[PDB]
Design a binder for this molecule. Sequence first.
Ligand SMILES: OC[C@H]1O[C@@](CO)(O[C@H]2O[C@H](CO)[C@@H](O)[C@H](O)[C@H]2O)[C@@H](O)[C@@H]1O
Length: 634
Amino acid sequence: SYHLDTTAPPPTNLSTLPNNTLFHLWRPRAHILPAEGQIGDPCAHYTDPSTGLFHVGFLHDGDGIAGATTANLATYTDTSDNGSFLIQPGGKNDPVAVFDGAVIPVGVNNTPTLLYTSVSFLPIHWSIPYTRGSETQSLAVARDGGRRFDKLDQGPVIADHPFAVDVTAFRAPFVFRSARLDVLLSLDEEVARNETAVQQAVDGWTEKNAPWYVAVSGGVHGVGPAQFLYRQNGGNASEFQYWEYLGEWWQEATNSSWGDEGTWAGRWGFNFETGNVLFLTEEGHDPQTGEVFVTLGTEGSGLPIVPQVSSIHDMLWAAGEVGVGSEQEGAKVEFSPSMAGFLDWGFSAYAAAGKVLPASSAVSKTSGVEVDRYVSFVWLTGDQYEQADGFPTAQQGWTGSLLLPRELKVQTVENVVDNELVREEGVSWVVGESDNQTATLRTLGITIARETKAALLANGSVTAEEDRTLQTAAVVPFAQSPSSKFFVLTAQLEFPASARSSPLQSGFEILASELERTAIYYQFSNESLVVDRSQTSAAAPTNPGLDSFTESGKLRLFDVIENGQEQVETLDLTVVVDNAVVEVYANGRFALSTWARSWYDNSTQIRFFHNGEGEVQFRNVSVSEGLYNAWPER
Ligand SMILES: OC[C@H]1O[C@@](CO)(O[C@H]2O[C@H](CO)[C@@H](O)[C@H](O)[C@H]2O)[C@@H](O)[C@@H]1O
């Protein structure tokens, strides 16, 4: 008879324990996840026009889409009990399953309408033959508060993938409006060429009567991944039955990749998944002025291939312009990347689903936000996309979570020295202005939704640490560490120009006791923020299901002129440890998330870390403990 004692050594085999015995050990408190069970792709978010409430959706137990609503973006309420589902398979269009979908706020009967992938056959994978009719796109209407979506009584409105095209996947429709797509499709061919005449048209565009675009994700066997573009037939905002196919507005060659060696934004892989089309400004989201950005998951594989297995699940993003399809009879429009990166460098991070959050939303009024934002929710699969080695799933009682809501916008890096570090090929940024002297850079901005960040530090205890410098190898525990695994660690690290060339590794050690620790440090050798999990869990050695491989992402610290003086860019860190869920943010442009399933309650020590190689200066190091409860009503 074994009752869980986390002050004692864990059992050698966690999978033998009784169901739900591990329900709270690693569970987060300020993250979006169902009351119990498993959570899949987040999807179907939308601001309810009538109430201003923001709805969040996500696949649940592989049995359809479930939901919840929020008024502040800080706290949530399940739409209903028993799973809080909104729609599930069993219909004539989705007899086998219900995949990712999106919502048009004012659609059929002027109510929230869901366009989603209705599934009729399984399995479905880029590495195996595609069964005709596997995935179709259907409509459902929100009924009784967005607390339930009723499938319209008719077949799918997009009943088949492009004609005779041997697609690898046809799913995850995402709806959006675009001033530039309307102009490009409305103008002439020799007139919609000059950016002069086009811009002039874009200036008149009006969002409220604009038609809707639909980007469907997948690829084509033998040719490459791609996104399939559609739009209300004839550009008629009142048409929801027929969608004119606009072509493969974006495609890449099989397992090709950004940059010559795929260093900043993985590989395009074998198939595109869960595409999101955004229009960003330096302040937020604007479908008329915003630059086109696209977030998407790409599925990779090493050789030889393992049927129905995707070894790599990259959570990428790209930005670029959209233009006419040249002079040949193909895609009406074409997305051309100028830069690309990672929305989250976590192995387990994937399938993002975001949405525009209007300044007119209840969330924004209450909070006082004056602009439109685009909030993104990244998935953090709990069992390595179901390839885990016997994770004690029955013992935990749940699987996966969503990462903290994030605001996406155009972020600029000013006063940057225009050197080889800024002119490299295939990077995740473009030079704004450059006198050949300083260059302002433009890149994707990634930050925690402000209301959520406020709620995290809202009643937490604050403990600062004196600025410190380290030269010789050392591990210096904080003057005082939290006594729980719920906290926000923030710090600024400064390095000497001389460090770029050294084997320097500097950061912190968290969730640490004598038998456990988790390392988070910056590395110049490959300029990478690294999360060393080799010692995170005393239980991992004997429980292979608890993955302990290293996680890391690329982050380049540029040479800049701060006070009429040059210097290596300051590494601005923000680490949120919401229990088994850890998220590493850096310079309002980086994000790396992973699981840190430490076992003992004692493992809460925090230490400064430096490997002697080089020199580092820590500044403004502080810790806020407590976070908050994202689900009061539970
Ligand atoms: O649960 C379906 C949902 O999962 C995603 C994102 O992870 O794709 C996954 O499931 C597909 C098939 O059943 C696999 O082919 C794919 O490799 C896997 O990542 C979404 O694309 C899909 O809607």
